[PDB]
Design a protein around this nucleic acid. Sequence first.
RNA 1: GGAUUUUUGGAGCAGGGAGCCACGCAUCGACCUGGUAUUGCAGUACCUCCAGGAACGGUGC
Lengths: 423, 74, 66, 162, 85, 85, 80, 82, 94, 79
Amino acid sequence: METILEQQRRYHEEKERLMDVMAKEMLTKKSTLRDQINSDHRTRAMQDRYMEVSGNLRDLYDDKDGLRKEELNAISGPNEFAEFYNRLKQIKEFHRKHFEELLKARENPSEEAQNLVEFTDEEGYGRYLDLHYINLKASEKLDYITYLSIFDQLFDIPKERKNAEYKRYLEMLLEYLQDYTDRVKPLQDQNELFEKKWENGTFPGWPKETSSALTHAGAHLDLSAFSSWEELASLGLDRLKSALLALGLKCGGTLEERAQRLFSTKGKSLESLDTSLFAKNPKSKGTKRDTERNKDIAFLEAQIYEYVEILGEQRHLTHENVQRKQARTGEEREEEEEEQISESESEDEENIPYWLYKLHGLNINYNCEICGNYTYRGPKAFQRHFAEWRHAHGMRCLGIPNTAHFANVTQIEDAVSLWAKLK
Amino acid sequence: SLPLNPKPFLNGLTGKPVMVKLKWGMEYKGYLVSVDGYMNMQLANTEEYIDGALSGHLGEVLIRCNNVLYIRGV
Amino acid sequence: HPPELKKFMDKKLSLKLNGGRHVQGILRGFDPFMNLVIDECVEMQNNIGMVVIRGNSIIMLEALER
Amino acid sequence: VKLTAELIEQAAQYTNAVRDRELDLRGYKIPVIENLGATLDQFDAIDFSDNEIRKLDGFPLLRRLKTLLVNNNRICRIGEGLDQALPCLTELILTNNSLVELGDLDPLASLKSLTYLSILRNPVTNKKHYRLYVIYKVPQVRVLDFQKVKLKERQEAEKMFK
Amino acid sequence: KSSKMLQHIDYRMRCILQDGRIFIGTFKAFDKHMNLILCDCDEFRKIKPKNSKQAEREEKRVLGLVLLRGENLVSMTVEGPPPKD
Amino acid sequence: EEEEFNTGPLSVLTQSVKNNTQVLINCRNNKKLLGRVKAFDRHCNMVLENVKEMWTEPVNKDRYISKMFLRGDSVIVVLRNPLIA
Amino acid sequence: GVPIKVLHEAEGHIVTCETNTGEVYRGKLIEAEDNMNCQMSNITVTYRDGRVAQLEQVYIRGSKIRFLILPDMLKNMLKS
Amino acid sequence: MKLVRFLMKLSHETVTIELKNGTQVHGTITGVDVSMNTHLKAVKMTLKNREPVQLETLSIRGNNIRYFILPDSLPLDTLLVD
Amino acid sequence: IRPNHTIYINNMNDKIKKEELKRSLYALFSQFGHVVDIVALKTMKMRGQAFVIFKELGSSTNALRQLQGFPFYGKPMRIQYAKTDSDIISKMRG
Amino acid sequence: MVQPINLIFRYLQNRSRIQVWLYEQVNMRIEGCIIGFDEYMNLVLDDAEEIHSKTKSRKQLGRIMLKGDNITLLQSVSN
RNA sequence: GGAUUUUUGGAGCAGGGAGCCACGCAUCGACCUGGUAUUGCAGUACCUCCAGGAACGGUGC
């Protein structure tokens, strides 16, 4: 049957093709990797990163490459994302997959259908091509991801990862605090908290509205994070954070004070003299209850914390934006909005009447009797009908001879006596 | 009869013993004092028949029009 | 306004009514309230002839024709 | 002529004769089934007749797909996770394809709603006990090759292979 | 003022239906009857979460762009601020 | 219009407001509201005083409500009587 | 009404409709009247039990519609 | 006469409203309109068979109201003047 | 009886329910070309019969020759070109 | 085209006995001879009957005015 | 500006019991085994009849 050798071969070949594609990309615009790598640096501290000079001059070896705009960098990063997905899949199936008389046996059947006149140059070319849209040069996107659109992932106010839109959450927040004493900037001041978010909470951490809000917000920040950095392994980060959550807490709440001892995160919100009483409190009915009810919230809070830390630069960038727009005038704010809009909707790679038919006398009900009791919609139409093929056929075949004496005819009867007057 | 309409029928039945069925299955027997344009109904010496059985003797009663299923003279 | 039903005139139809009730028949006419005249009507089956359906209680209709 | 998103978007779309929403993917010379995501799970039936597909595999999760017409292709193997991407697959027409060994039909046992199956004009058909093998290994089938699976055949397939 | 609806326009809104469903979407338009236009709209059945420790979301369905008829609307509250986009 | 409020079936309400007399309102909620009519309108919206609400749950129940507004659609029946006396 | 104009805009597009009884009809919107009366074609209907069916031609009264889902192609009436 | 006009005067009052679907609403009226559509703030709303939820704002379609329970203090005779 | 877009089948096992018959008919005949529609009734008159309509005429001819006497639900089907043109064909042509 | 109102006007003139389907109540239907009717489809029925489809029992009513609110459907009966 | 497509309502009410498993009444429908009739050129509520089976589905109380 199917020789596995060929399949595994095609697999290794496709993997090679993809590596080559995302490598060509990383080549034309090193930023693609650099950007990514930098972020990675602050998540997995071990990661080795290139010489700063390379990063700045946007070069990989000797040649400094042209700087690209954000929308394109992000685009290609998501494209490379799907590419890496394909690669991971193929690698998987491959892992799960990995005489002479038979040689002549098959070579004999290869004689089948000799008359197959057709040129076949489409195995490596259709793949190479499948991973490298327009006629010649209009859309950077590969045929592989031709229906990939960032605007369906990023809103206009986020500007492909430049800012994160927190106005919405300021609204919800106003709804949460049941007042209006809170301004966008004071709200951001609140977010900054995220020990502070634990020991100096905006609201009581056992408040419902508050915990719900915090959930929604946390989710947003996380999705934004991974959205803005496709190239980094999401699962890796997730698991890292989860393990930090489980392992850091257990011994001492990870939060320790030389005075009050050991604090409990989310569930209890109490300190403890020594580690001893802290441990024998983690089995008590109280802590069981709390850790069993407020688990999801505590975890979400924590995520909001670490993800906001990983995005400090974006948080600052946005807060800045806020203050700017705020200090604008009308015209200024308008033109700025225009700019954000243009950036958002820009290619990632640049190159009758009745009053007349009544006046004319048409569309008015009328009828000719001699012709099939026919209907005519205009009085001008009738003269034309009279100087007509069928009208003269009715006359002449009727025995009433043609032309101009009979013009004013309507009914068949009268023109019969008129024709008797003629002859 | 030569066309006997809703409105006159009801007007003929004013001053008379009637029973009104409501959509909800309650029934109210009494003298029809009056009806109005929207077919709201006013009974006197009303009685209530639920499951067709005398339930309560109620006196003077307004019935909102939307509740009415049908009216019977009786 | 009229309901735009001239297209459905003299066609066989399937009528879903409130109460989980369903009938089938030929559209013979309508008014602005969507009250219908349905001929050769059948209760879903027993033949009931030509009937009036009040538009009030019409959930949905489906043509059995093109 | 890759089965692409663009290809699917210009493809005849209609309500078929048995009242189901069907997508027409006939005669395009498609070799590999892929990119079905773009149909958006909006079809009850997909017609892949007269193409060059080798393996019935590569489907996204498609909850509404109930009928697959795969006539005159080159199907020689059936993918293993088919129920995970096609949970309500009820009818599978594989007439005139290349399935040769009874064991190659094994992956159809996992399609829990599969009720109408047609494998005619496949070499596998002439294998000894082909009908009983299908009946015992794919008991959810009620009509096989346009013939009713009967009780007596089920029992007979219970003896052999018990 | 007429503003009581116009204020909440562009905001994310939690709308309650007569059968008891919860529609959450971006409130973009209304009218005389309170027919509503809801962008990026999802439906919930079981709960409106206030941080339910077990889970916040069960029977959630993504709908998208929704026009709801006012006949079947009961009430609305502010769920979150406008998305910037 | 006043004539129709004065002599028509709504004269029951007109009479109750004028005499400050009690009326029992059978209500759609399966509850009954017993009290005095401060105001009423076409729809049978009412502003009521000294309302005793009575219902059943078998167990009978009641509760006192000094001041309240009733939307008139909920009206089934309105009863005038020797109740006030 | 503003929503009504947006509905008429969806004529010729594939839309989803739920009735007052919870039957779900998906297909092409041919005509939408002012009162929300809806003519559609080549429908898939999903009943309350979950079962599906196929219909060529339907017309649903506006009053007995609970809601409609329209394409996202329309989202881009932002004046109001 | 038109009693909705009376309700429109009750901005900044706190009331309890019982809904047709049994739900109970306690909050401060920000606005009643001509359709009796009612808007509130600082709202504690208890759907039948739940514990209350608090909302900073709630907007009710008028038709869904059964009745308003008004403040005992309310000076009705003043409000009934036009 | 000249070649026709529609084929008339008779000698069919009339115990199959109508919707199942039509769906198997559709499946079986899809191998030769797109089947536009199938008309089959269970009246006394029409039971055991069906009209299968194809978009292409060559498809109808191929179906006729290749499935003559094909065992379907236990009986050998008899196929023939229909006497008249199908309403759907007439509407699609003009 | 036949207009629905006219059908009724016909029922009226004919004195055909009529059976009415009521709204959201299947177990009972109403019967009678339309004597007159109004713009709201409110009907005056003569020698009217409640028909219990479940109990096969008939309740005798005489002079009935049925509000149109309840009308789902209007049919004629030979009886 | 309360009379059929929105805002003056057609709503209201009814489920535990027995030892994870099983369930009262009425109506309609395919439906499943046997056997049996029919060989017929159409556009469809449905479709032979006879006997047996329903730990089947839907609606209402």
